[PDB]
């Protein structure tokens, strides 16, 4: 198992940008799909990217493409979101959660994944 805590949560104008890290601790970082979420006001958790094992792709929802981008650091066993040109309707809180165990199962969907951090919070102001 792995454990997984957010930083990088704050404020942000509209336009701006933001980055999201999370810092996995335990033994076998580069065998886990590790995932970004975010829960806004009043609706479900939403997935946002997913990087592969080997970090060789990684899957964007359509809400985000262009200006959110997962990269990872082994060595720092850390996964980073950046985000660019928020708009107020990326408030909301975000997550990251890991998967290591193989099958069937979805990359996007909360519910598909074992492990998951506390949560950071990002609002953009206008």
Not at 89 to 104: E, I, L, Q, V
Request: positive net charge.
């Amino acid at each position: 198992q792995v454990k997984l805590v957010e930083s990088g949560g704050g404020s942000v104008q509209a336009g701006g940008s933001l980055r999201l890290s999370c810092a996995a601790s335990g033994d076998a970082f580069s065998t886990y799909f590790m995932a970004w979420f975010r829960q806004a006001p009043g609706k479900e958790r939403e997935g946002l990217a997913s990087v592969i094992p080997g970090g060789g792709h990684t899957y964007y929802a359509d809400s985000v493409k262009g200006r959110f981008a997962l990269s990872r650091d082994a060595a720092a066993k850390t996964v980073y979101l950046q985000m660019d040109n928020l708009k107020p309707d990326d408030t909301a809180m975000y997550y990251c959660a890991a998967r290591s165990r193989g099958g069937t199962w979805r990359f996007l969907n909360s519910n598909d994944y074992d492990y998951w951090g506390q949560g950071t919070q990002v609002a953009v102001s206008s």
